[PDB]
């Protein structure tokens, strides 16, 4: 769970004909002190055979995933970055195992020094299991 915080802001001017007359306005913001998220995804070969999705596109896709946030800086965004990427590659045109089993091989939990609130990626530990023989697991990405 996350605990949003709400912060108050002020301003030196007004936009329109307001007869206040100095301090002139007040605002608001919402922010998350810290949080960690997880995402899943799939790729289908039969459909690619219809649209023509090719390998170089796959390489470009990996690159985009790795470098997604570098160009997205903004006033409200804060600092965001990616940390891990794991890929499972089946050995034939149709899978060799159910997906939900694969997603279970990845586990995340607090490190030894939990110390209550988490405030950095160092507060968690990540581990990956061993995949079935019919699937290849590569994680260096």
């Amino acid at each position: 769970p996350v605990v949003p915080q709400e912060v108050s802001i002020t301003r030196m001017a007004v936009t329109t004909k307001a007869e206040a007359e100095d301090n002139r306005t007040m605002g608001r913001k919402h922010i998350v002190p810290y949080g960690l998220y997880v995402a899943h995804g799939f790729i289908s070969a039969p459909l690619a055979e219809k649209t023509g999705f090719s390998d170089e596109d796959l390489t470009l896709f990996w690159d985009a995933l790795v470098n997604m946030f570098e160009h997205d800086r903004s006033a409200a965004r804060g600092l965001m970055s990616s940390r891990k990427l794991i890929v499972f590659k089946h050995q034939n045109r149709l899978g060799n195992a159910p997906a939900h089993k694969l997603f279970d091989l990845v586990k995340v939990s607090r490190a030894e020094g939990s110390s209550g609130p988490a405030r950095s990626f160092a507060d968690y530990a990540v581990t990956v299991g061993q995949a079935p023989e019919g699937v290849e697991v590569k994680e260096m990405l």
């Binding site: 605990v3 915080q5 709400e6 108050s8």
Partner: protein, 117 residues
């Protein structure tokens, strides 16, 4: 439904306490331009652990004026505060949204009682 003096839900008790403190201040300094409700209401409901230690000082500061007059209205507030705090154990550092809703409910329940005959 009305003020339930036996509920013992911590946000509810905090809400009651805030109302009684506001009442005491109003009694102490009539016609104040600014009141604790305007200055602190937003902060207290979100992070009780940060501000209550300050509100309680001014509480005594206000009660001192009254108890120093022939105005005997002035240990009633002290008695109420003793009753309410008697059920608390600690101040939360942070509270969830629904907890804040309960806090507001308790505040409003408490306030109505003070103005009955």
């Amino acid at each position: 439904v009305s003020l339930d003096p036996a509920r013992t839900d911590r946000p509810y008790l905090l809400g009651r306490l805030f109302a009684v403190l506001e009442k005491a201040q109003e009694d102490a300094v009539p016609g104040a331009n600014a009141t604790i409700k305007d200055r602190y209401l937003a902060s207290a409901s979100a992070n009780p652990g940060q501000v209550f230690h300050m509100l309680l000082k001014n509480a005594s500061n206000h009660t001192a004026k009254l108890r120093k007059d022939p105005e005997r209205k002035a240990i009633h507030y002290e008695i109420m505060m003793q009753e309410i705090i008697d059920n608390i154990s600690d101040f939360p550092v942070t509270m969830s949204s629904d907890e804040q809703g309960l806090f507001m409910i308790g505040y409003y329940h408490q306030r109505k009682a003070l103005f009955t005959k």
